[model samples]
Target: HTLVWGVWVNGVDQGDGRNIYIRSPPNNNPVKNLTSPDMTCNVDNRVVPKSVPVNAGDTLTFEWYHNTRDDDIIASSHHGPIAVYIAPAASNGQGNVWVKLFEDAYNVTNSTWAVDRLITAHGQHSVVVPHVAPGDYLFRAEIIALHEADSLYSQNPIRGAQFYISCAQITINSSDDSTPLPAGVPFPGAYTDSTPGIQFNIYTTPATSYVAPPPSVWSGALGGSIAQVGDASLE
Candidate 1:
C-alpha cells in the first residue's frame, strides 16, 4: 500500500523561510508568493509532486502536533496562495491555518492529502483519509490563513507547530492473496490485502487443582472422569 506524511508551522517559528520535510531524506521548499504552487514536497525530496500506494482496509492516520513551542522563528518557501503569517494570540484571524492530504501524486493543482480546519495553537490531531489507489503518488500538508477577513500575513506574534502522516495496510490473511473471491460475491471498491497486523502479548495461567472436564460436553456437564476432562481441557 501507500503512505503520506507532513507538518505545519506557526508564523512565530516558521516565518517566511522555506519549509523543510523530514522523511527518509530531508526536503526543503523555498517561500515565494503565498499562492505559488511549488511550495509542496514530492518524493525524492524534490520541490515537485509525489505518488504513493494504498490497499483496501488500509488506514492513513495523520498527526498535527506542536513543535519548537517556545517562540522561535522559522521559514519555508513562499509557494502559497498568500504570504505566511502568524497570530499567536488571535485564534480567529491570521496565524490560523488549515492542513490537508491529497491522493494524487505531484498534484498541487487543486487536490489535498487531507485538509484540516484552522490550526492556530500547538497540539496534535489525527484522521484517516479513506479509499486510495495502489501506486506512486504525492501527499502534502499546507498552512493557510483562517479566512479572507484576516490577511494571510499577520503582524501578531506567531506560535509554532507541526503535523505528521502514518499509514498502514489491512489484510484478512497472512498470505499475498490478491484476488480469490467466491463466485457471485461483490468486493469493495477500495479493497486490498496489504494491511499489517498489530502485535500484542498474551498471558496464560498455570493449571492447578482445577480438574479439567471430560472429552464430551455431557461428561463435563455431569462431572465425568477428571482424565477425560483433562484431555478435553488440554486441547
Candidate 2:
C-alpha cells in the first residue's frame, strides 16, 4: 500500500494532509476494481474542503509514502505505470473533465518502470502542471500496480491490477496563460476491465514494453521533462 503524504509546488510545502483527501491515521491501499466507482479516486475518500494554490507552470510534486514519509516507499513488486491528471472546474471529483498531464510506464530498453523511478526518487513523483485558464481544479496522482495483473478478476469479485490514487483540491493561478484545456474522458468509463493497460501482465515470459494509460498528456502542458520542486530531479 502507498499514498501521497505531502503536496508541494515550486519548492513550497503546502502542508501535509491539508487539501488532499486522505484517510485518518493514513493507510496505503489500492483499488483493484476498474469498473467500480472506487477507481475514480479511492473508496470512502471525502472532500478536504480546501483548495491549495499552485501556479499554472509550477512543479507539482506528490510525496508518496507507504506509511510515513520515511517508510520504505512501496514494495518493489508493485512496479508499474504512473500518471497525473487535471480536472478543470472541479466537480465532486467526478465527470469527464480529466486531462492527463503525464504518464510514465516500463522502458524495456532500460528495464525501468515508473514505480521504480518513484522509489529511487525517494517516493517523489513530480510533473509540471499544464498552463491553462486560472481556476479551481482537482489534481489526481495515480500509479497502477501490475504485480498481480496477470489475471483479470471477472475475468469479479477478485483481484487484478491495483490503482493507488489520491486527489488534491487546487486553485491554479496564472497571470499570462489563457489556453483552453482539451476535453477529458470520463472516469468509470475511461477504463474498462479489458483495457489493454488494465488487463496487462507485467511478468510476460519474454518481457514486453508497457502501455501507460490513454488520453495522452494535454497539449497545453509545459512538459519537456518532469520537474522537481526545487531542482530538476524528476525532470
Candidate 3:
C-alpha cells in the first residue's frame, strides 16, 4: 500500500502527510477507471487536510512507500511517469481546473523511467514550487503505472493503466512576482484509454520517449526544474 507518507519543504517534513490526501488505507492501488472522478485526487475520503504554508521558489518533496515511509518504494513492475498538478484549493464546484506542474515520463537511453528514478531516490521525489499568484492551491502528485497499460475496461472493468494520485493542500504566502497559473486541463476528461501513452505496451517494444497523457506542464513553472539530481526535465 504505497502512498505519500510525508511532504517536505527543503529538508523539513511538513507535519507528516497531514496536508495530503490519499486513499482510506493508503495503498499503492491505481485508479483503473480512466474517466472516473477518483482519477482527480484519488478517493476523497481522507479527513480534510490542513493547508501548509509555503512560498514561491520553494522545494516540495513527496515521500512515498508501499506502506510506510521506510518500506521499499513502489513495485518495480509499476513504471511510468510522475507528474504534479495545481488547482485552486477552494475550487469547490469548478470543473476541469487543473494545470500540469511538471512531468517526467521515460528516458529511452537505458529504458529508465520516472519510477526507476523514484526508487533510486529512495521514494523521495521533489519539485520546484512555481511562482504562481499567492493563494490556496491543491498540489497534485501522480504516478501512472503502465504495467497493465495494454489492457482495458472493455476487456475487464477493473483492468487498465493505473494512476496513483494524491493531493497536498498549500497556501502560498508570497509570490515574489506571482505569475498566474495558466488555464488548466480537466481530470476525468483529461485522460482516456486511447490517450497517447495510456495504451502502451511497456514490454512489447522499445520507446524513444513518452510524455504520457493529460496536458503539458504549466508554462509558469520555475523553469519546470525538479529539485534533485537525476531529476532532469525543464517543462
Candidate 4:
C-alpha cells in the first residue's frame, strides 16, 4: 500500500536528497498499528536533526509511494479519514502535546473518504501552516485506514485497522500572536478504539458524513487547494 515516504517545505525536499525524516533505518516502513502504543507518535525516538524554516502561510507537502517503486498502490479499499496536526516543541524540543490544524474526514462530491481521494490524486498531500507565534513545531500527517475496523475487538484480519503516520520538524518564523494557537491534545489520549471514526466500517456501511479530529482547523488557516503546490494530477 501507499505510505508517506518523504516531506517537502516551500517546494524543497526535507531530507539529505534521498532519505526522509519518517523513514527510520533497517525497516524503512512508516505504517503502524492503530491500536498500538506507538500509534500516537512515531516509535522512532530520533527527531530529524534538520528542521525546515517556514512562514505562517507556507505550504508543507507530503510525498507518498507504494511499498515498492514498481507500481502505485491504489487505496480504494482503504477508505478512511486523513488529518494534519502541529505541536509546539517543548523547551527541549521533545514533547507530544499536539493540536489539530487541518483535517479532511469525508468527500462530499465523490462519496468517499480521505484515503480514496488521496490515492486518486497519486498520493501527494499538502497542508498550509497555520498562522501562529514563531517557534519550533512538529507537523504530523496521519491516515486512518478503516478497511478492517468494522469490529472493535474482533479477531478477523479484516477487522484490524492500520495507521499511516509521519512527522517533520520545522521552525516557524514571523510571530503572529494575534492568531492564537489551537488548544492542544496529548498524543496517546487523542484516539481511542471506541471513537466513531476509529472503529467505523467502510465496507458494509459507507460514510455519508464524517467528524474531523478535534481542535479543528484554525479560523485563518488556508484551504488545502491553496496549500497544494506540486504536480498532483494523476493520469
If scored against the real structure, what TM-score would every candidate get?
0.27, 0.87, 0.87, 0.80
- Clash pairs, candidate 3, are 1-66, 2-28, 2-66
The per-model lDDT (C-alpha) reads: 0.20, 0.71, 0.72, 0.62
**Superposed model 1: Cα runs more than 4 Å off:** 1-32, 35-37, 42-54, 66-122, 147-149, 152-235
Cα lDDT tens digits for candidate 4, 92-137: 2233357676788777776767776676655667877777889887
- Candidate 1, poorest ten consecutive residues by summed lDDT: 220-229
- What digit string (tens of lDDT, one per residue) describes model 1 on residues 1-120? 111223222111211112222221233222223222222222233322222233323332222222332111122211111111111111211121212222211113332111222121
The alpha-carbon lDDT assigned to residue 210 of candidate 2 equals 65
Please give the clash total of every predicted structure, in order: 48, 2, 3, 0
Off by over 4 Å in 2: 18-26, 205-208, 224-235
Tens-digit lDDT string for candidate 3 (1-235): 3577767776676656643443333356667887777777786634465677889998888777786554567899888888988888777314778888788887666568888888877677777788888888888888888887878865776668878888877788878756777678788788876778888888875655455886876768763332333221221
Ranking by lDDT: 3, 2, 4, 1
- Say which prediction, candidate 1 or candidate 2, comes out ahead on TM-score: 2
Clashing pairs in 4: none
Q: How large an RMSD does model 2 have? A: 3.4
What tens-digit string does per-residue lDDT give for candidate 2 at 112-165? 788887777777767777667788877778888888887876674467888888
